[PDB]
Amino acid sequence: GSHSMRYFYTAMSRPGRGEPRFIAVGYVDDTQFVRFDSDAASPRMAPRAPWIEQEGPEYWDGETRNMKASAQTYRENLRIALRYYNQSEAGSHIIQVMYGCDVGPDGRLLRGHDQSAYDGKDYIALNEDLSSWTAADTAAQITQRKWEAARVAEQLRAYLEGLCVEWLRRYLENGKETLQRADPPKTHVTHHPISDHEATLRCWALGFYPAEITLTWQRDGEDQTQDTELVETRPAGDRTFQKWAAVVVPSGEEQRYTCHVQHEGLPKPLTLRWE
C-alpha cells in the first residue's frame, strides 16, 4: 500500500521557567520511530521502534545534531513571532511544524508536506508544488518573503523528493514485518436498552492497524451519519487502534440496522448485525 513519513516539531516557550522546550517525534504511517526532547537528562534523537535500532552511531549523531540545531532555530523563531504579533514577553507560546512525504505502492513520491503553526493556528505552509507558499496572515507574509529570498522552498523540495522518500523506502524494508502488515479489525455489535422503547447498538472495531477505518450504521440501507455517535479512533498501546460507532434505535427494529466496516486489512467491507 501507500505510506507516509512524518516528523512533528513542537516548540513551547515558558517565560520565567527557562528556555523553550523543543520536542520532535518521527512517524512512518501510524508507527512512531524516533523522539527528541530538549528537557531530557541527556537530549538525543532516540529509537522508539525496534526496526530503527539497527541504525549506527553516525545516524544517531547526525539526527541528534540536527535536532539540537533545529531546537535553537525554533527558540529564536519563538522570539521572532513575539515581535511579528506585538506580543509581550510574559506569555507562553507554541510553534508546531509537520513535514514529510507520501509514497505509493511503487515507492514513488505522491506528495510532500511542510506546514507550520503558531499558537495552534495555521502560520505558513508549503504548497503541493513544493515551490510556493501559503501564508495565513501578515506576520507569516514576512517569513514568506524571507523564505522566497533564501529559496527555502527549493531546499525543501530537494529533501522531499530525495532523502525523505529514500529514507522512507529504507524504513519500510527494515520494518517490513510490521510497517507493511495491516491488521484487520476484530468486530462485534453490542446491544443495550435505554428505555422500554429504545436501545443502543454499538459497533466495535478492535486491534486494527493502520488507524484509518470507517464505521457506519445503516438503517434500511441508508447511512445514519447525522444520527450516529462516532468516537475518535484511539490507540490501544500495542500498536493497534480501536473505534466504535453507536446508534439509538427503537425497540424491535434492531435487525433493520447494519454496521459497515472498511479497513485496509479487509479484502472486502464487512457488514454486521446485532445477534
Binding site: 516528523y7 520532535a24 539526527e63 523563531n77 514576512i142 524571507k146 531546499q155 529533501y159 525523505c164
Partner: peptide, 10 residues
C-alpha cells in the same frame, strides 16, 4: 539526515 536540515529563520 532523515530529518531535514533545512531550517530557515522565521
Amino acid at each position: 539526515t532523515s530529518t531535514t536540515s533545512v531550517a530557515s529563520s522565521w
